[PDB]
Design a protein around this ligand. Structure first.
Ligand SMILES: [Zn+2]
Ligand SMILES: [Zn+2]
Lengths: 148, 108, 99, 85, 82, 94, 99, 83, 109, 93
DNA sequence: ATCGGATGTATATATCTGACACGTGCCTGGAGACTAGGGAGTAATCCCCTTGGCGGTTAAAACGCGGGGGACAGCGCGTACGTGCGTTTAAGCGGTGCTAGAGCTGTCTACGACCAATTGAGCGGCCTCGGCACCGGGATTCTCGAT
DNA sequence: ATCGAGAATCCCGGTGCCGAGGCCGCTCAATTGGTCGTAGACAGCTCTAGCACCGCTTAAACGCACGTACGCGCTGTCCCCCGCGTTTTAACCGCCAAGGGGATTACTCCCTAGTCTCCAGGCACGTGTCAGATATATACATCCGAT
């Protein structure tokens, strides 16, 4: 339907000018399921860390937001253990004009800095707002153990 | 929707769903209360509140102010076809009345 | 020689002035005294919260202002501009307050 | 001045505008996309993100949603794509 | 004790109320009629307010009693609670 | 201290910041909004209770509140309110 | 030679005849057809109980009579005896039906 | 099997009889169309709520009780048909 | 009282106290219901019924009839002062209207 | 079949207590049933509202008395209150 | 002021028919005895907020006068409504036939109430700065008498 | 048709003050997890009454004609509201002072709900008869034209 054409144009646009250090593509025979790879931003404790994400497109696109989930384990107040993501783009302020490139850029910006005001995990959020060295250290070992 | 977040965010609303559920359970309305009624009621209340507030803010911007006083609420309500019908028997304190002079009384 | 406005052109100015404001048009102390005197029949040694009197004043003014519109419409219907007590009586009867 | 075909592309379905509606924010899009957005999205402009509930409610009772002036232009200038879809 | 307080609703106050109501010309017998009807309205509302107060075993007439009395007669008021 | 008193002020302010991100609100206007929300809640809940009692039921479901909204609101407010509530329930379920 | 009644002395008799009776004044089949036609927009292919039509008729006739009383009072207020459409409009406005 | 122009079945003599019961001695010539319009508005207002009530109950027949409920909801209580 | 006979007879009423108690308990009005509320409510209902039936019987007997019909109920309700205010918005089916004619319309002398 | 309850027999008993020689039709009996149901609903609802306003969970006789005083007009309210108080006092002993 | 048609309403008598008042079977809802626990009554304390008084200043009310515009009464016209008669139309009544759908019964599966542990959302108390109120001066615009 | 003077209203710039909005601590109510009793969702059968059609009366509707009374416009009179000026009255504001009663907390006890058992009161069904509606023939109130 319209969703198939929209996703095809989305893939074409992503191919024309791929963004910085992120790469998404269809998993296989169908365009509905996607997989993406993200690099840790330079101004972050996730240096050289590869992260994998899975994207599921609801059949009623673009009027319903896609659902993205982390595949690897990351230390961040906005990501739960199983890969759940807390972001306003995916659930709250989604409009049909948005693109997968836009949500990926939003995820990258989330990796740039966290949002402790409304966190998914409050304990690591308060420890992050208490001290900096502990979070940076533990994120370093998390990205050295799981990301790399 | 996936669980493990507050109830009022799964529905995408701003008005509380737990408070509305409790007010419906203890309000002496019915013996049992369904699981989807609070969501629907909160959505309706939020829609009506946004509907009133948008017109009130428009009137406030018309009057060169950056604040909403009861006069702006009265202006927003009375100048709308359906909102006036909904709040017809309701008096708003410090709201005044709309300007309207009958054409017979004007000078000729 | 002194400047004088013809009858009817100052009443319209008052109409335009008072339909633009939001204040209370009855003095507060006489209305509070009237409320207390009326209430003294039902129960003696009553005390009134400072906002109960304000609520009563707002309700009474919003009632009288709404009554005067129907009174004016009756007066205009009778091919007049002066409102008379029979206009008030007809408006109250049709509304259902007098019957 | 007359708009071209490239500048007459809907921002949602990426097709030719049909029964277009122009929101007060001077943002135009075709009627089916508008109805789907109002039914399932947040009831705002998908681009501007401003409340258009009162405007839609007031203009639905009079069937004045469509932009006839540009609708006739699109229906006349470009029969091929509009007739095809 | 208080008596003859209905005459504190002066002629200028009734004229201002009429002007806000949209009245251009007023006769001379309007004021007594207005005083009578306002007295009837006040009695009707205050009776229910005092009944609500007396049920609650109170001696102070709160704004909630007045709001409930007004709502009981199809005259809902916004701004003083409720 | 003074006992806690619940109100709809926070959510009204949130909606206000959603619609007009540069406009404030007074205190009397906030009280009026709170009263309006309470009144509409009472109207819809009471209508739904009577509607459920008519059909010999024991539960207030989304159907009852939907029909109460259809009855109480005027011609064009009812359609949009029903659409918003249905969208909210559909989003909440899945 | 033939008997003729003075204008208004036969219409002052129908008032006494119809204020002493309780029968319904509108024919039943046309009103039932009107009710069935009106209910086509909201839901197609409905069925009406024999009592639903009767309830609608007995409510509507009473409403019309109550409206005509206020219309007559409005006509009398303007120093007339006949009732114009403007009397109906003023009665409906003051009652709050159309506002 | 649709019906049309059945509001003309509320004839002039019927409106005259309703006016006579109301207490009207003399009637103008334009009263009848106004009365028909008011009749139509009132009937639509009542029947909309009656049909809503009968639709909530998963029925295809409107009962006397639905009409009574609609009338009571609109502020005109009716006695003699139940409730 | 003797705590032996029926509650309606114990309180000296004709309207049922047990049925009113059940209706108050199952009517979704409050969590609990006192033991004296049904008696009070039944007494009030019986008083109002007796008043209206007395007035309707008077109206019927004034018409040389031995049965109350809705017309007599309408006459009794409309003629009275308090019962007309209590039932101001109520329509009595097959009740007609109270006969009156404005004094302006009567023929000139 | 299903049985439908009504206040018909009690209304007839009151009628024979007031006017021993007058009967009642069927439509008049239905109107009486509707009137009794309406007054029951009014008084019970107002009593519930009074109980809720004062943070109570019980509907006692004083709340019914206050509801009666608020609903009925002057003389009707006075006589109804007197009759209800008499009935409760006679019932309690 | 009536006088006598002419019409319509009210009154009295026969009659017969269907709705009202009463009687019978029974089955479901109300009464009777008992136990448990939480809601409400009562006493005590705290402190908020309601009532009462006093002095000043000044905005609003009261009183009076001149007059002009609006309310009220009287005349005249012509047209629109009432009353009556003859003709066409469709309501009202009875009777028959069909079936859509309201109404009731039996199973059972998913939904909602109760309960215990927990912790974050929302309330109360503080504090600061910008939006709104106020004042002083000027520009613009209705208003009215004179042309 | 207009020119111009006195009065009222809107605009603009500067000053200040208080309440609107953000922040911090914390207490309790909303969320999660698990269990269980029952509400209503669904399938199946019954039999009620809602719908459709047909023919016969005759009651109500409709169209037309005449005439007349009432709606509406015009003119005249007068008197009562309106606009303005000066004086008198008390409302509004700021302040202080006392204590009445509203609001919270703790303890207790007794009133009401839940459960089981039992039986009679009220509901469905059937029947007989008399109150009231209908038909018919007088008696009188009422209206309208005419001196
Ligand atoms: Zn599109
Ligand atoms: Zn836009």
């Amino acid at each position: 339907h319209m969703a198939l054409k929209r996703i095809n144009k989305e893939l074409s646009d992503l191919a024309r000018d791929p963004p910085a250090q992120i790469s998404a593509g269809p998993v296989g025979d169908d365009m509905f399921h996607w997989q993406a790879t993200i690099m840790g931003p330079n101004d972050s404790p996730y240096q050289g860390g590869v992260f994998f994400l899975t994207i599921h497109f609801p059949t009623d696109y673009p009027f319903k937001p896609p659902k993205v989930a982390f595949t690897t384990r990351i230390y961040h107040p906005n990501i739960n253990s199983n890969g759940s993501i807390c972001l306003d783009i995916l659930r709250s302020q989604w409009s049909p004009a948005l693109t997968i490139s836009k949500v990926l850029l939003s995820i990258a910006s989330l990796l740039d800095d966290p949002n402790p005001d409304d966190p998914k995990v409050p304990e690591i959020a308060r420890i992050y707002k208490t001290d900096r060295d502990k979070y940076n250290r533990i994120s370093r070992e998390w990205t050295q153990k799981y990301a790399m | 929707s996936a669980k493990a977040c507050t109830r009022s965010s799964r529905a995408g609303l701003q008005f509380p769903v737990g408070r509305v559920h409790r007010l419906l359970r203890k309000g002496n309305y019915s013996e049992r209360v369904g699981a989807g009624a609070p969501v629907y009621l909160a959505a309706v209340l939020e829609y009506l509140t946004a509907e009133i507030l948008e017109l009130a803010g428009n009137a406030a911007r018309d009057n060169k102010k950056t604040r909403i006083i009861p006069r702006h609420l009265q202006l927003a309500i009375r100048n709308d076809e359906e909102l006036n019908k909904l709040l017809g028997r309701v008096t708003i304190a410090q709201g005044g009345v709309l300007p309207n002079i009958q054409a017979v009384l004007l000078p000729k | 020689k002194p400047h004088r406005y013809r009858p009817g052109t100052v009443a319209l100015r008052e109409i335009r002035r008072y339909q633009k404001s939001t204040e209370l048009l009855i003095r507060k102390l006489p209305f509070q005294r009237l409320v207390r005197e009326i209430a003294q029949d039902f129960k003696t040694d009553l005390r009134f919260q400072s906002s109960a009197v304000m609520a009563l004043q707002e309700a009474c003014e919003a009632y009288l202002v709404g009554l005067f519109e129907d009174t004016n419409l009756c007066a205009i219907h009778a091919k007049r501009v002066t409102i008379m007590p029979k206009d008030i009586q007809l408006a109250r009867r049709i509304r259902g307050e007098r019957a | 001045a007359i708009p071209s075909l490239s500048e007459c592309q809907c921002g949602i379905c990426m097709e030719i505008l049909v029964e277009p509606v122009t929101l007060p924010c001077n943002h135009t899009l075709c009627k089916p996309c508008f109805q789907s957005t109002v039914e399932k999205a947040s009831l705002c402009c998908p681009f501007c993100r401003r409340r258009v509930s009162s405007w839609t409610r007031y203009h639905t009772r009079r069937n004045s949603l469509v932009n006839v002036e540009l609708w006739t232009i699109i229906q006349k200038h470009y029969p091929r794509e509009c007739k095809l879809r | 004790v208080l008596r003859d307080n209905i005459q504190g609703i002066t002629k200028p106050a009734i004229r201002r109320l009429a002007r806000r109501g949209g009245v251009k010309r007023i006769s001379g017998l309007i004021y007594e009629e207005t005083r009578g009807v306002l007295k009837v309205f006040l009695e009707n509302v205050i009776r229910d307010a005092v009944t609500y107060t007396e049920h609650a075993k109170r001696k102070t007439v709160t704004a909630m009693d007045v709001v409930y009395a007004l709502k009981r007669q199809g005259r809902t008021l916004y701004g003083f609670g409720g | 201290k003074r006992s806690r008193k619940e109100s709809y002020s926070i959510y009204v302010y949130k909606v206000l910041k959603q619609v007009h991100p540069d406009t404030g609100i007074s205190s009397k206007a906030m009280g009026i909004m709170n009263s309006f929300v309470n009144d509409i809640f009472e109207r819809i809940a009471g209508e739904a209770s009577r509607l459920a009692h008519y059909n010999k039921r024991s539960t207030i479901t989304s159907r009852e509140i939907q029909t109460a909204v259809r009855l109480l609101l005027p011609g064009e407010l009812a359609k949009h309110a029903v659409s918003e509530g249905t969208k909210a329930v559909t989003k909440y379920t899945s």
